[PDB]
Write a protein that binds this ligand. Structure first.
Ligand SMILES: Cc1cc2nc3c(=O)[nH]c(=O)nc-3n(C[C@H](O)[C@H](O)[C@H](O)COP(=O)(O)OP(=O)(O)OC[C@H]3O[C@@H](n4cnc5c(N)ncnc54)[C@H](O)[C@@H]3O)c2cc1C
Length: 295
């Protein structure tokens, strides 16, 4: 029932770019683009939580072909237009430091993708991943802990859950559980999909809670910048009480190193009731209720 590896690196799907919109608004940090691809002419199917590979053009410094980089799928199975013909990605341009040869180094595949023109052909492989899939249980609770581009799989769940055209397209899935997104970003102009996330919270105030950790605008109780781990510690008792429900699934996605602060908050909360979190978390992973994708 889960599509996997319908296309592989030795014979990828050649899709075309339809659009390439900026997501970071004026005053924000960096470049993050929303890129939609045409899937007509092939049989690429996918579902929510999965990833696809992109093969960038060119050769590395040794003269070898550039390999694929994985990107979380940012659209539901139906695409943004709910027509089953497209797929979207949420790509941040990677750039960095002086202690790495030269001055500023630009990532090959993320620079390629964030500056790609409509009409351009792209090499696509996949889909891949069964670690971040959404339960078909409409009464599930869904905790979502994201930073930056880790918002991508979360957007596929929330759109499936709360978009009107999705609800009309998926008769089998009419969500009525509770979902909570904690989204960590550096500025308010960096809140990817801010307008659409906040519209969902207005229509479904009993089914969706939205919490931000904005580091250049908020301080934690110790005086430092507000990060997602500071927000998780703030609500650690509530998050633990929801995690004890048999229906609750937790998703964590973003850049590596966010998992350590989430566990230390949830550890202190579990300890109060005589539970060892790291032991409890193993059972959750085997049960398929603890989903992690960091990179
Ligand atoms: C499952 C999965 C899902 C992903 N989803 C997304 C997504 O939705 N959106 C998204 O933008 N990205 C996503 N990523 C990351 C993405 O695959 C690529 O790694 C990223 O876009 C950078 O690729 P590049 O080709 O731009 O960089 P490369 O050109 O390969 O540059 C990366 C290399 O340079 C180095 N480097 C990187 N950062 C630094 C730093 N601060 N200091 C020093 N050296 C550094 C390392 O050697 C790293 O291997 C995902 C990764 C995985 C594994």
């Amino acid at each position: 029932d889960v599509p996997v590896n319908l296309y592989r690196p030795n014979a990828p799907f050649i899709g075309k770019v339809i659009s390439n919109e900026p997501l970071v608004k004026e005053g924000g940090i960096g470049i993050v683009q929303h890129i939609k691809f045409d899937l007509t002419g092939g049989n690429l199917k996918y579902i929510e939580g999965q990833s696809i590979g992109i093969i960038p053009p060119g050769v590395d410094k040794n003269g070898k072909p550039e390999r694929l980089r994985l990107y979380s799928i940012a659209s539901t199975r139906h695409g943004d237009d709910v027509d089953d013909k497209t797929i979207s990605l949420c790509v941040r341009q990677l750039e960095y430091k002086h202690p790495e040869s030269g001055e500023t180094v630009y990532g090959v595949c993320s620079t390629y993708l964030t500056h790609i023109e409509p009409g351009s052909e792209v090499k696509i492989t996949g889909p891949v991943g069964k670690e971040m899939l959404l339960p078909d249980d409409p009464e599930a609770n869904v905790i979502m802990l994201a930073t930056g581009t880790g918002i991508a799989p979360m957007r596929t769940y929330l759109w499936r859950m709360f978009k009107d055209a999705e609800r009309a397209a998926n008769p089998e899935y009419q969500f009525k559980g509770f979902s909570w997104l904690v989204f960590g970003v550096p500025t308010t102009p960096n809140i990817l999909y801010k307008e659409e996330l906040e519209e969902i919270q207005q229509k479904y105030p009993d089914n969706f809670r939205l919490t931000y950790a904005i580091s250049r605008e908020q301080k934690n109780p110790q005086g430092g910048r507000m990060y997602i781990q500071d927000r998780v510690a703030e609500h650690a008792d509530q998050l633990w009480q929801l995690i004890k429900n048999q229906k609750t699934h937790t998703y964590i996605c973003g850049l590596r190193g966010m998992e350590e602060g989430i566990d230390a908050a949830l550890s202190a909360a579990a300890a109060k009731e005589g539970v060892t979190w790291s032991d409890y978390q193993k059972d959750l992973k085997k049960a398929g209720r603890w989903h992690v994708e960091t990179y």
